[PDB]
Structures are given as C-alpha cells and as structure tokens.
Ligand binder design. Sequence first.
Ligand SMILES: Cc1c(-c2cccnc2)nc2cc(F)ccc2c1N1CC(C)(C)c2ccc(N3CCOCC3)cc21
Length: 839
Amino acid sequence: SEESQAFQRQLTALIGYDVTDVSNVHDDELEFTRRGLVTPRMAEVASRDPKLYAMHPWVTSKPLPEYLWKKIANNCIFIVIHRSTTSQTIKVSPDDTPGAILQSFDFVLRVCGRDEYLVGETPIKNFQWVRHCLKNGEEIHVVLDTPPDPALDEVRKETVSLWDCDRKFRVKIRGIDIPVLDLTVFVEANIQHGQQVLCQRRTSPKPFTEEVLWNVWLEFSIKIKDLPKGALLNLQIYCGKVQLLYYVNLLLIDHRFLLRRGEYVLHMWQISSFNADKLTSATNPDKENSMSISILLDNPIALPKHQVRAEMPNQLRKQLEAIIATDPLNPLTAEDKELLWHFRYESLKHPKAYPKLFSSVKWGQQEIVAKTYQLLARREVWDQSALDVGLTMQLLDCNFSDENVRAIAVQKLESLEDDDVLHYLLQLVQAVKFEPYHDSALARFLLKRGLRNKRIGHFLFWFLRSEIAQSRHYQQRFAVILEAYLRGCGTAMLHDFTQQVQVIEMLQKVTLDIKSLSAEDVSSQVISQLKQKLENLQNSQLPESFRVPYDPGLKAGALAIEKCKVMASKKKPLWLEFKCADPTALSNETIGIIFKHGDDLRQDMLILQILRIMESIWETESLDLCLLPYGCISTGDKIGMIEIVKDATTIAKIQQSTVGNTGAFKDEVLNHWLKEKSPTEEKFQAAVERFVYSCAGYCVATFVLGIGDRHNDNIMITETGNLFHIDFGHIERVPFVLTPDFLFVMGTSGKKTSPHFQKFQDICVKAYLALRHHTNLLIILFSMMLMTGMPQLTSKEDIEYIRDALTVGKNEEDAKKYFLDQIEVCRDKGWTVQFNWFL
Ligand SMILES: Cc1c(-c2cccnc2)nc2cc(F)ccc2c1N1CC(C)(C)c2ccc(N3CCOCC3)cc21
C-alpha cells in the first residue's frame, strides 16, 4: 500500500505505540487480534446511523429526578433560540421532542458554545444538557444550525485432540540470565487459573550468578487434558526466608485453542500480591536491562468445544442462601464451595450466586469444567434477570479467567444505554487487564460501543491512550484495541484526535521544560520564559482550536497568555487559560486547564470516576449532593490535565488570608468569606445550602473510599458554596474532614445543633445508607480500582477497608449510629489533625 504509508504512521502518532512492531512477542496473538477485530469494526461502522453519529445526541432514559422536577415552573421550561444577532425565548413542556420544537414557527438545534446537539426522538428533558441547565439553574441557549455532514465521518476503505492426552504436564527450565547483577535463587512454575494456583513446582536452589542453568524437567500432577483455556504458566524467581524478584507469564493454551509448544526466551518484570500487572501475558520489552528465563514445552494438540436437582433440606437451603447473601469480598471455605457446587442448579436460579458459584468450580478438572459449560447453556434466569452492574463487574475481575463466564457478563453490559457506558467506561477499560486474551467479548464490546457513539469513542481513546503511555504491561493490547477503534471512528475524529494529541504534546514539553528552570517559590525569570514559550508556541504550532479532552463539547481556541502562570508548588504545574473557539459561545469565561508532572493522575481519574458513580446512585434515590468531580485526563507518565474549576479557592488559603501562616485557625473565617463573596442574602443562604450538601457528599464519599483524612489545601470551595476535594494522587487520624469552620457555616460551635447541622446529619445518613444499597457494586469498583490503579502490591487488608467503611452485615439502624459516631470524632478533634499536618 502507498496511502497506508501516511495512515499507519498517523495511527502510531495517535496511539503512542507502534502496533506493527514484533520485537516484543513470542507468538502471533497481537497480530491475530488486529485481524480478528476487523469484523466487529466493519459491523459497527456499517450499521450505525450516519447522521445520529455525526450529532451524537447525549441522552438518558432515567427519570428526571425529584430535585429537578421541583425546579420545573408550571410544567414549562424556557429555551432561547439564536439566529444572527436577534433571538427569542420559547415556552416548552418537558415532553417536547426537538422536532416538536422545530415546527414551532432542514435545520437542527445546536447548543450555544458547544459541539452538542439537541436532536432525536427523545423528549428535551432526556438530553443531559437540559438536565445540566436545571441542575445549576441556567437558561437553555440553543442555535439554529445546519446539521454537520456525515461525509466527514466517512471511514477510509480497508493433529491429535487435547482430551485424549493423559500425560502429565511438564516444562523444562533451561535457566535464567541477568545481564548485570550474593545469595541463592530458584524458579517457581505455577499453573494458574485466575488468581487461583492449580499446581506448583520448584527448581532446587542454585547460586545467583549472572547466568544460572538447571536443565530440569519440572513435572506437574495436573494432566494436559485437565488444562483449561486461559491457563497461565506463571514462572517466578525468588532469592535467599525468600523474596519474589521477577515474574513472567505464558498462556498454555494459545489464541487458536492450541497447546503451547517449543523453545521460549521470555523477558521478565521486576518488583517495585493483587495487582493487574502480575497477570499480564506481555513480556518485558527492556531486553538489555531485564532478567530472562529460558524454557521448553514439548509432547499439534488442540482443545475442543462441547455439544439436575432442586429439592433440598431446610438447614441446607438456608446455609446456601446465607452464602449467596455475603459480600463479594467474603472468603468461601471448602465447605462453602462444595455446597454451591453440589447445589449447582438451585444456585443457578440466583443471579447473585454466579460469582460465588463459578468460584466453586475446580477448573483443573476437564469433566467439572464440562459440567460448568453444561450449566451455562441453561441460563434462562440469568438471561432474564434485570441488569446488575455490581454483579456484572464481579465476573469481569481478576478471579475469572474463563471466556464463557466472562462472556455472560459482557452479555449483560450489552443492554446498558450509552449513558451508563460512560459511567462505567473507565473501569471497563481497566477490566481489560484481567482478560486472559487480547481478543475478548469485553474488548469488542468497548470497540463497538465506542464506534457507535462519538462520546464513548472520544473517552475510550483517552482511556486507552492513558494506559498505552504508562503501562509496559498492557500497552500492546490496548494499542491493538485503540488501532481498531481508530480505523472506524471516521476522518472527522481522526482529525480531532490528531489536533488533540499535538496540542497536549506541545504543552507537556512546555511543562517538562519549565519545571527544569526552578529551584524548590516562583522565580521572576521563569515568568519571562513561560510567557515567552506560550507566545512562541501560538506563533507557529497551536491550531485555531482543539477539543478539550475532559469535555469534548468544548472547543478551545487562542491562549489567554496574560492569565497563564505556574503555581507556588513543588511540582510546578501550569495554569493555562484558553478563549473558547466558538463565536456562538455567549460566555466570556475562559477554559482553564492545569498541566502537571509529578503526580500519577490515573489514581485521580479512578477516584473521580467513582464519585460520578456515587452521584448517579444518589440520583436513583432523588438525592443530590453537589459533588464536584472536575475533569481530569491522564495523558502520559506521571503527567496530565485538570479542569480549572471557576471561582474556587482552597480552605487553607482562606485560613492564610484572614489569620496568616502558622495557622492559628479561626472558626468564623469561612462563613464570612462566603458572606464576602455573596452579593445578596438570597444568594448567600443558597450558598450555605450548597455547602451543606457539598460537605456531606464529600464527607460520605471520602470516608467510604478511605481518603477522608486530608490536609486542607486539598479541599476547595467555589464562591457559590460548593465544597470539593482535590489532588487525590497522594494516597493519629480522623474519618473525614469536618472542621469547626465548616460547622460554623452550618451554624454550630463546639457543642450545639443548628437547623442546618441537623440537615447535614440527615443528608449524611441518607447518603451513607444509599451507598450501602449498592455495597456489592462499590466493593467491586474499589477492589478493581486498587488492582488496576494503585501499584502497592495491594493486599486483602487494603481492600477489606471498604467492608468496614460500608459496615457490611450490619443493619440500617446500627450503621446510622456508626456514621454519626464518625461525625462526632471530627466534632471532638477540632483543629488537631489539621494543625498536626503542618510540620
Ligand atoms: C489548589 C491550586 C491552586 C489554587 C487556586 C486557587 C486558590 N488557591 C490555590 N492554584 C494552582 C495553580 C497552578 F498553576 C497549578 C495548581 C494549582 C493548584 N493545585 C495544586 C495541585 C495539587 C497541583 C492541584 C490539583 C488540582 C487542582 N484543582 C484546582 C482547579 O480545580 C480543579 C482541581 C488544583 C491544584
């Protein structure tokens, strides 16, 4: 090809990884998966509606919450429509479709300021933009526009069976080789299914020289026929009690159902328990620095494909139901497992048993797996059950290495409306890390949902890009998936993405480079160089405009160079501000972005995403808690962008402005800072109200996530009362932050109970118990968040935190008093922890 000369090179610049490269493989799975994904791409590319894809209307089908109906004025909402200069307002009823607004005099209603549209056979109350304008209390400003051309979305034209082998499995350990290094070393070969170790053998310990040869056949007790698809040969290196130093993996049954054979020279990863990177089929690309193991597999041999009780004692049925009932983090004993397995079919009638049930399968037995597959072909009850994401997630996590088990989870995700895919996208993307193969139902599901929706597609991109840039363990796989998406998203977005990448690489350089200029307190000279470079950048590199990666509605244009700065901070982040590229954007507010190196923002992304989830949980119960989960995209290695939240300062700086440094903390400061930012009493008390919700939200949220105890230049408030935590990329005590200054805004002091503080407790306990009505879901998101986002060798102990936090097994009454105890610890401690942070 001759125009693939541009296209492929263009794809590599957009992906941030050369997909075609085969220097770091030992088989052809990645290349296979590229080819295997063409079909699911062609299928979505071809079946999606050209025009709806072009306008990507962002819509929901949940009920309009109680808090937003109470904001409707006599079943009528106002919409302002703009032509040239002149515009006029129109009365509308929540049920009005855009078409039923068009004939009210071919064009299309575009939102003012944004690349957001109000088109399609859904009521106007069902568009998120409208729901946003009610949320904050804004008028809906639209523009009579001609619909964008689908031609721009155009997509460029593109011999013996296994269950007959009764011989025991064995692998030759030839030896190991470190290029550069006084103890001893041995090799541990685990046959793994999920996190479960089926069989384990060791070499005898040898002296640890830069080369160690064993030449030994490690014979296993598991038969070849007893190997299940998705089994991992996990080779590990310990030294000497012992210590794990290098790990590496190899699928025993490969992507064409063939049993793995022959000579392998695999490069291994170092160490710096439950951790997604520990499961990777990827080899270490650093050939020169890293340790490698040499092995031999020999005996082709292929794995094939296949083609009742329900009357139990009382004591037994209950014991089963007690097991089904326990949380996702509860250990199943041998007794538990044997019980679930025997009552297989009774258990199948309970969708909630599924995780626990398929955790009872002895995957090291061919016949058992067969019975399991029999069982899965009988899933009417499952197939009929209403979607449960908490349940669906549990089956996609690290404890399930089975294509068919995982398929049934992805089956349920199929029914998510595009709104919920956005809510779970990040976590789903991360769950790809648990998939035993590069091609899987989960990867294809993300592929096609991404292709069907420019919004899911846009974030999909950034999420895969984020990992490709900083995970050697999973860049190859994500790269394959992203290339797949890119070859289907259509020229328009490829042009968008291209612009987006260029801009952020221009700016990352200006961050990299500026950071270097400062001895750790802003220099006078650094202002010269920054403002020079930002002018020197706008001259001949920055485009007329680019999409804001954390908000793809918003196009950013020229820089507000005058307003750009670098914080008095040790990580020297950039404070950039951009004019909106949209003339129709009847704002004047800039678009504010922070660029920061030094922090791992993948951790922020994860926590922020969880917060958006807690929000929608609250929505199901008609609660609003006015969390502020600001946009934040990680783009590379310890570097990314952060939404600047307009009119907001930190609690600490409010303490630093009235009292000064060495914080002799005063209580009245916040309340009269608020007062002094409020114009009227009306807008003041609304701001105090917003604070009661804001505070309680972040109280409940931070405690549950165990990130509650915080230094308070990490808590921010808007001039309109909105409290919100920031910089999550960090982590005697305190459950969450509820200081005398917050309490005084509520109207309390030391030991009292104002009208608002009662409401605070009321709102708290409601929020806390609402979360508990999704215990299972939060537990799994938290587990998954730890395993894929926080490198820490994260243990059971780390994860068991949220069990306690959400007081599992406890009744509603008992937990309400648990949470109220928490509040009272904060009441009791006052300024102690805050003061203690200082040093
Ligand atoms: C709090 C604050 C502030 C700040 C703003 C108002 C009052 N006091 C401090 N200014 C900054 C200016 C910069 F150029 C860079 C960073 C900050 C900054 N930080 C520090 C840090 C940890 C990098 C950070 C992380 C998130 C945020 N956000 C602030 C914008 O709101 C969304 C998130 C700010 C800051």
